[PDB]
């Protein structure tokens, strides 16, 4: 069954899943719709999700952000946006003071208006993440209060859920259940300092979020379920269209990337296709996914298939230069001149020699040269970056020469010359710098240098150094 070579263990593993019926596609897409809209509605039922959007638009008109980073546009321009957001704030400022039973009818509508806003994927992600992290915050206190009773103070969980469900905030459970004279009751006193003080955040969630610990779970739980449904369906679809992916990738074979690489990038393409597809447009999913997969394949190939990466326009530019070569090959009877395809092509046309160069792929350094022997290309590539020893002995010898010759001048001329150049010192120094260091400054030094150079100019000072210039 397993022949190794993962091309197979893939080819066979995907072949199990049966192709979709034309109706089943609609079934799956419907399931997608169900899941998503579920999470959207769950988002609309969160007060903080609304108040956040408001706080964001207050930063949008305040020039701390742009309308593009908040909304992708509504179910529908900056004016229309301003008035739509005004509508949002309107429903919010009504629903807020009606909390005193009848409020619900508006809290429903408050969702609807908020559902008119199509959020940037990033923003939506921020929201959902905030909800789930908030659920982490709830779980912290739930497990703290649980472990501090059951694990530490020895109380059964069976009796622990009794006064829990429905409240888990007020002191009805904490201060009124410890006097019950149960085997686990009087044991609840030891940790009473730790449980009641950490309850601070527990009742705090009903302030920030605007929901009791009851609803907070229900809403985002429904959200989670929706997400699950969605991913389930979408995955199913992709797994159904893998065959299409392979069929596409078979065309791009020798472009310089491996087969399985091609089909994998294509798979990514198909995933994106399922993510962005809408069956409500009556467009066949096959021909729609085809383009996306093809796009992923091509775009990937151009990008990563080279030892030396080249820009997209450059690649296409090269191909354009191949096209001309084809016709003009037989047409001209031998081949078009190096400058022919030049005027044949739009751009400055001298770029041919340039473009024709950078295009070429580097020859494998391990390419065996003749004799079949261990002689391989790279073995013959000499180091030009090294320096010859014959020169290295001179570089060491010059340091003696300039040293003796500098021992020749006056100590201050030697100091000025060793300073004006980097001789046996860090960097070198400006003439003014040499000035400040000598206490004598400006033109003065510039003169001392000349005469110094003058003393080392004529022979018997020079005869040692003059032999150093070839």
């Amino acid at each position: 069954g397993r022949t190794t070579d993962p091309v197979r263990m893939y080819m066979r593993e995907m072949g199990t899943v049966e192709l979709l019926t034309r109706e089943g596609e609609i079934d799956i897409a419907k399931r997608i719709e169900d899941g998503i809209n579920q999470v959207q509605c769950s988002v609309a039922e969160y007060p903080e999700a609304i108040t956040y959007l408001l706080e964001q638009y207050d930063r949008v008109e305040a020039e701390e952000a742009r309308l593009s980073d908040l909304i992708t546009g509504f179910v529908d321009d900056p004016e229309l946006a301003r008035e739509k957001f005004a509508e949002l704030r309107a429903q919010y400022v009504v629903t807020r003071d009606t909390i005193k039973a009848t409020a619900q009818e508006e809290i429903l509508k408050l969702s609807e208006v908020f559902k008119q806003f199509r959020l940037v994927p990033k923003q939506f992600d921020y929201l959902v993440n905030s909800m789930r992290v908030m659920m982490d915050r709830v779980r912290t206190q739930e497990r703290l209060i649980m472990k501090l009773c059951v694990e530490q103070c020895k109380m059964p969980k069976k009796n622990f859920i009794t006064l829990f469900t429905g409240n888990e905030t007020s002191d009805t459970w904490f201060n009124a259940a410890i006097a019950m004279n149960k085997p686990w009751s009087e044991k609840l006193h030891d940790v009473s300092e730790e449980v009641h003080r950490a309850l601070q955040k527990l009742q705090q969630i009903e302030e920030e979020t605007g929901l009791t610990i009851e609803q907070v779970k229900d809403i985002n739980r429904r959200m989670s379920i929706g997400e699950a449904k969605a991913r389930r369906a979408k995955k199913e679809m992709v797994e159904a269209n893998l065959r299409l992916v392979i069929s596409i990738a078979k065309k791009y074979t020798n472009r310089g990337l491996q087969f399985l690489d091609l089909i994998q990038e294509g798979n990514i393409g198909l995933m994106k296709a399922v993510d962005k597809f809408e069956y409500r447009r009556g467009y066949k999913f096959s021909t729609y996914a085809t383009w996306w997969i093809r796009q992923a394949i091509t775009r990937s190939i151009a990008d990563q298939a080279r030892t030396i990466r080249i820009p997209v326009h450059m690649i296409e530019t090269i191909n354009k230069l191949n096209r001309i070569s084809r016709q003009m090959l037989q047409e001209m009877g031998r081949e078009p001149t190096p400058e022919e395809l030049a005027e044949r092509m739009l751009m400055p046309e001298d770029k041919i020699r340039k473009v024709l160069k950078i295009a070429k792929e580097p020859i494998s350094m391990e390419t065996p040269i003749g004799d079949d022997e261990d002689s391989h290309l790279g073995d013959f590539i000499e180091d030009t970056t090294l320096e010859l020893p014959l020169d290295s002995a001179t570089t060491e010898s010059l340091r003696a020469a300039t040293h003796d010759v500098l021992a020749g001048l006056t100590a201050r001329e030697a100091k000025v010359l060793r300073m004006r150049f980097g001789i046996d010192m860090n960097t070198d120094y400006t003439l003014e710098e040499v000035g400040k260091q000598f206490d004598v400054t400006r033109e003065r030094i510039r003169q001392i240098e000349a005469k110094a150079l003058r003393k080392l100019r004529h022979p018997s000072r020079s005869e040692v150094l003059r032999s150093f210039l070839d």
Partner: protein, 1166 residues
């Protein structure tokens, strides 16, 4: 004393598995991108296979962005892009890493023959791979439910099991699963349980595997490697400069294959992280994981899965494993070869004017070779201002440089070498003599050592740079310091051809000639008589000579006398130094005799006089051979007058037997044998005809009528002296040549009737051609065979070196003359010469000790033993040496280029292998493959079986496949019964007593037997005698020593019988074992000492076992060796030759022995 932190001179090396954190420790950055260079500005894209930040600056001491360009700013990390400005060489040093998303198996530990992950987990390979490919689920930490720990399930099975048991059961799949396995593994518990199980049940099949596995386990534990590390979390990346992108001519780029691979790995890995963040379906991410596994594997060692191909090129890309392994079988660069500076080479010429301590070198060559010396010496005297100007001077080739070159050349030796290097004499040192020309001049006497002809052979030259190398070359590699072959004490400086024809022509006597029967005062006026043309070079004459004998105590006796000799011998006597007797030059002076002259001279006068003597012999040889006017004409080859008659008679015989076949008196094959016999006999007749004729036919007159002596004919003198040619070839020149044999090997019954002096027609030549082609083919093949043999030999010996001075054991082998068949195929004197007596020997009467205890037996001792009748001498050998991990000089022998006892620290294993290997081109079941079989200790095809135990025997049971043989010892029991197939004709008497190791059948026998039944000395004796039987039959001289050291290396391993320290059946070093039992006989356990049994391992087998793993990586399969060492965390301490050669430090032998010693003792001590 604070020990140290930073760089010291390191000892040993360690190898082991790599931790993710350790891998990160090497890594100075994570390569996050497949990109290499920008595509326009060739600068590296940051965080890529080629990068400035992670690895290093592009150009020396310069930042990438270009902000800090000054050599001052160095330890500075640039603010723009962090690059510490430092030498570009660091880009050849700093490594990197890649954090892999999904876990990955290291293909070296998956696919190594004893799969490491496999046997460590006690799990089969195919299972593990089936798990790695996500083909099935595997259990981990099953707990108590329904299932085993290592058990494997399927989709449906895993589902059902999970449905039954939610928790307290665990199963994973893929690389994560195998990692989880290895990590959950507790080795210690397995150790305890396995010890118990080992102890409980008694079955061979059970406790064998049991003990093997527990040993393996505890070894891996003691290593320090944790199993998890077999699965790679992190993947190290090799420095960019070791896989260069460097450009070429025409703006073209060339890069290694590691970039394609690494780039692939990075790509697939990043794409995997991407697919994770996209929440892809299972199948997709699985395919991606598998692909990642394949990519990583292909990177590490390619060819163990799919053999991935490089971009646009069919040829499979070279992976890191191939980078390490190299090519050409097993060659790791310090093996195959290495380019070397200060060297040269060229065609070679003669140069007889040279003394043997020197040689010619081309002017230009010496100039370019010594160039640095020439510069420094040019400016030392002050002829050149600075080194630059010096270069300008030697470049212009000013007249003043030649003298300076003559200065730097004078006492400075040079090394000369030939292409087929076999024995150490393949490279020799000489004193350079500046010569005008492009050709190298090489002293004639040395032409034998190199095996170099003048037909266009080239020699190479190397300059001994360091002072130590100069003195090494002069005191060791020097020509004059090796006058004797290391294989046998016979001189390798023996005169070759022209010279021996000269000395032969000189001393010889024709019946009559000028000055016949006269008398002369001394050799002076003898020569004066000859040159003036008054007397002939060869005539019988009495002359007075003064000969010396040093027979007094350290003192030369002088005596004079009238010797009956010839003019030529008298002239030649002038050369013969001092204490040599005149007798030596009074003979005909053949090549053998002219060699024994030099020999005796060396064993009498010493080195220097032998050297100058040899030189003079060469000079006079050439001169008088020149004067001789020896030539070769077409009439110099004389055919028998009776040839045609022999041909016709032998031709009558064929028609006799033919008529008999026509009438049916004889069969076809018998006829064939008959005719072939008569033709062979005919060839013998013509041969012994032309031989007698060409030899004695010279018939000349002295004062009487007639007389006849040995011929003065040229070709005869040439063949007889030994200058060149031989009876075999001369036979083919005059008489008919042989009978030829078709490629099948069926010998044609129509021999070649004609010869080379006559014409050969079409058929005869065509028939000869096959013989020629098979000749060249066979020889060219046996060269390679010899090479392979020497290779196996040096590999098996090598590190064996003289270490301790004397082990001091009475042990040794009994040395008797070979005495084969009829008389003495080799004497006792040669076998015992240069060796050392195990114990004192007697005369016929005793309390008179000729040779005391252990003493070197030189020529005088051996001749003193020859005076007396002593037929028996026990001699110390390297095989019996008590010294562990080496041989004591007192055990080895004196043999060397010098007559003195072997030096302390000389590496004997190498020279032994070389000595066995050099003649191997001269060897023809029998033959060279026979030698190869011997050293391999291969059991023959149809062997013989020796008696297991002494005592009366009888035939047991009946016929099924075997008829059992029941042995019956005198006292002890008789459980021993061997099953001998009865379809093989027996030998052993049903009613007779047979000693252990007797002949129970016929045919050759495996030396394993001879070792076990007949003893150690017995088996070493068998090997040495058989191999010497092969060589000596070809006329090859090899001392028993070298063979004996090879033998010692063969038996280095032995399998224990008893217990009390280590395991039962373990094969181990008899050095380790003997040292442990000698140490356990006292103190420790009172005596717990364990018995062993000596084992015989073939050379190629014994070569496998080497402490140093770096050594094993050289000549063995590299891929396996590195792993197999790395798991046990093996620590290579060097201590051997090969390893120290690889690592590039002084050899722990020879000159370096004073180093490694003064070190070795400093180590593991105060």
């Amino acid at each position: 004393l604070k020990a140290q932190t930073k760089t010291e001179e390191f000892d040993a090396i360690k190898i082991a598995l790599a931790s993710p954190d350790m891998i990160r420790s090497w890594s100075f950055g994570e390569v996050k991108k497949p990109e290499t260079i920008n595509y326009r500005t060739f600068k590296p894209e940051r965080d890529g296979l080629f990068c400035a930040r992670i690895f290093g600056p592009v150009k020396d001491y310069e930042c990438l962005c270009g902000k800090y360009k000054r050599l001052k700013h160095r330890g500075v990390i640039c603010e723009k892009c962090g690059v510490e400005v430092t030498q570009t060489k660091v880009r050849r040093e700093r490594m990197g890493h890649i954090e892999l998303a999904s876990p990955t198996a290291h293909i070296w530990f998956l696919k190594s023959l004893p799969s490491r992950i496999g046997l460590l987990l006690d799990m089969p390979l195919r299972d593990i791979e089936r798990v790695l490919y996500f083909e099935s689920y595997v259990v981990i930490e099953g707990g108590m439910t329904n299932l085993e720990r290592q058990q494997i399930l399927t989709e449906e099975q895993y589902l059902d099991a999970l449905e039954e048991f939610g928790d307290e059961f665990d199963a994973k799949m893929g690389a994560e699963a195998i990692q989880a396995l290895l990590k959950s593994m507790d080795l210690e518990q397995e150790c305890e349980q396995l010890r118990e199980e080992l102890n409980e049940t008694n079955s061979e099949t059970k406790r064998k595997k049991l003990t093997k596995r527990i040993k393996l386990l505890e070894a891996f534990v003691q290593s320090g490697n944790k199993p998890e590390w077999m699965i790679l979390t992190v993947l190290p990346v090799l420095p960019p400069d070791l896989r260069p992108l460097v450009p070429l001519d025409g703006g073209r780029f060339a890069t290694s294959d590691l970039n394609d691979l690494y780039r692939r790995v990075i790509n697939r890995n990043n794409r995997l992280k991407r697919l994770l963040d996209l929440a892809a379906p299972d199948i997709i991410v699985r395919n991606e994981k598998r692909m990642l596994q394949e990519a990583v594997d292909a990177l590490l060692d390619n060819g163990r899965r799919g053999r991935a191909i490089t971009g646009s090129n069919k040829r499979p890309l070279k992976s890191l494993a191939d980078m390490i392994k190299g090519k050409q079988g097993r060659f790791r660069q310090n093996l195959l070869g290495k380019r070397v500076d200060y060297s040269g080479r060229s065609v070679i010429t003669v140069g007889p004017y040279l003394r043997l301590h020197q040689c010619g070198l081309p002017k230009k060559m010496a100039l370019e070779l010594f160039k640095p010396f020439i510069y420094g010496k040019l400016e030392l005297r002050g002829l050149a201002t600075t080194i630059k100007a010096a270069k300008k001077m030697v470049e212009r080739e000013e007249a003043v440089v030649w003298d300076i070159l003559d200065e730097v050349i004078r006492e400075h030796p040079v090394l000369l070498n030939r292409a087929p290097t076999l024995h150490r004499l393949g490279i020799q040192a000489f004193e350079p003599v500046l010569i005008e020309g492009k050709a190298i001049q090489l002293h004639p006497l040395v032409c034998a050592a190199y095996n170099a002809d003048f037909d266009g052979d080239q020699m190479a030259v190397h300059v001994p740079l360091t002072l130590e190398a100069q003195l090494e070359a002069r005191a060791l590699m020097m020509s004059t310091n090796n006058i004797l072959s290391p294989a046998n004490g016979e001189p390798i400086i023996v005169p070759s051809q022209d010279v021996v024809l000269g000395l032969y022509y000189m001393t010889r006597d024709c019946v009559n000639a000028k000055g016949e029967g006269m008398v002369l005062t001394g050799p002076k006026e003898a020569e004066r008589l000859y040159r003036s043309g008054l007397a002939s070079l060869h005539a019988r004459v009495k002359v007075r000579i003064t000969e010396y004998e040093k027979d007094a105590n350290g003192e030369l006796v002088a005596k004079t006398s009238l010797k009956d000799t010839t003019v030529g011998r008298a002239i030649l006597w002038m050369i013969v130094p001092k204490g040599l007797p005149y007798s030596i030059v009074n003979q005909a002076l053949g090549k053998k005799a002219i060699s024994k002259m030099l020999n005796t001279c060396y064993r009498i006068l010493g080195l220097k006089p032998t050297v100058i003597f040899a030189d003079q012999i060469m000079y006079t040889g050439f001169a008088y051979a020149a004067r001789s006017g020896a030539s070769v004409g077409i009439d110099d080859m004389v055919i028998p007058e009776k040839k045609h008659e022999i041909i016709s008679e032998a031709e009558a015989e064929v028609a006799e037997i033919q008529e008999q076949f026509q009438s049916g008196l004889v069969t076809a094959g018998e006829r064939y044998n008959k005719v072939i016999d008569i033709w062979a006999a005919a060839n013998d007749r013509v041969s012994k005809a032309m031989m007698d004729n060409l030899q004695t036919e010279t018939v000349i007159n002295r004062d009487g009528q007639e007389e006849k002596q040995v011929s003065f004919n040229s070709i005869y003198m040439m063949a007889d002296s030994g200058a060149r040619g031989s009876a075999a070839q001369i036979r083919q020149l005059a008489g008919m040549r042989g009978l030829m044999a078709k490629p099948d090997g069926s010998i044609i019954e129509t021999p070649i009737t004609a010869n080379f002096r006559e014409g050969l027609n079409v058929l005869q030549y065509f028939i000869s051609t096959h013989g020629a082609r098979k000749g060249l083919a066979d020889t060219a093949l046996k060269t390679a065979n010899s090479g392979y043999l020497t290779r196996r030999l040096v590999d098996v010996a090598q590190d064996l070196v003289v270490t301790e001075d004397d082990c001091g054991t009475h042990e040794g082998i009994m040395m008797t003359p070979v005495i084969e068949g009829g008389d003495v195929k080799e004497p006792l004197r040669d076998r015992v010469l240069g060796r050392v007596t195990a114990e004192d020997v007697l005369k016929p009467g005793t309390a008179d000790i000729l040779v005391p205890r252990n003493t070197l037996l030189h020529e005088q001792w051996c001749d003193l033993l020859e005076e007396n009748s002593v037929d028996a001498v026990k001699v110390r050998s390297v095989v019996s040496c008590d010294t562990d991990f080496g041989v004591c000089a007192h055990c080895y022998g004196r043999d060397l280029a010098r007559g003195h006892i072997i030096n302390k620290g000389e590496a004997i294993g190498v020279i032994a292998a070389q000595s066995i290997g050099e003649p191997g081109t001269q060897l023809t079941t029998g033959g060279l493959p026979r030698v190869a079989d011997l050293f391999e200790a291969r059991r023959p095809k149809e062997p013989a079986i020796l008696a297991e135990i002494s005592g009366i025997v009888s035939f047991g049971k009946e016929t099924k496949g075997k008829r059992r043989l029941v042995i019956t010892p005198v006292d002890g029991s008789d459980p021993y019964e061997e099953m001998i197939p009865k379809w093989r004709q027996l030998n052993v008497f049903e009613g007779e007593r047979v000693e252990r190791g007797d002949v129970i059948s016929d045919g050759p026998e495996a030396p394993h037997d001879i070792l076990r039944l007949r003893g150690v000395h017995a088996v070493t004796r068998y090997i040495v005698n058989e191999v010497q039987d092969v060589y000596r039959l070809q006329g090859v001289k090899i001392n028993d020593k070298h063979i004996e050291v090879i033998v010692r290396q063969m038996l280095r391993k032995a399998t224990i019988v008893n217990a009390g320290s280590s395991d039962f059946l373990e094969g181990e070093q008899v050095e380790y074992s003997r040292v442990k039992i000698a140490n356990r006989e006292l103190e420790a356990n009172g005596k717990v000492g364990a018995t062993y049994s000596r084992d015989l391992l073939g050379i190629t087998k014994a070569s496998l076992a080497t402490e140093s793993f770096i050594s094993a990586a050289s000549f063995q399969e590299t891929t396996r060796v590195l792993t197999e060492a790395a798991v046990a965390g093996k620590r290579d301490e060097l201590r051997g030759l090969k390893e120290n050669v690889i690592v590039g430090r002084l050899i722990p032998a020879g000159t370096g022995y004073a180093y490694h010693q003064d070190r070795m003792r400093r180590r593991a001590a105060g």
